[PDB]
Design a protein around this ligand. Sequence first.
Ligand SMILES: [Zn+2]
Ligand SMILES: [Zn+2]
Length: 80
Amino acid sequence: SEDGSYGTDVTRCICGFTHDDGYMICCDKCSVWQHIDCMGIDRQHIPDTYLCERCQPRNLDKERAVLLQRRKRENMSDGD
Ligand SMILES: [Zn+2]
Ligand SMILES: [Zn+2]
């Protein structure tokens, strides 16, 4: 209805691919869920207050993040 929309936690990862890994983080500012490996963060060192590329003054390799999660789903095609 034309009033609003309730749904804070929204998975808008820059790779255009949703939760399959298990290794994700919520963006404290704009409330968007992204994959750790996508934002170039180490899964060994996970920050509390995550920011995504659009919240960070630094430009993260968004294209490279697409390449990783894309080739991931391309690789998920078993058979001969
Ligand atoms: Zn991703
Ligand atoms: Zn953000």
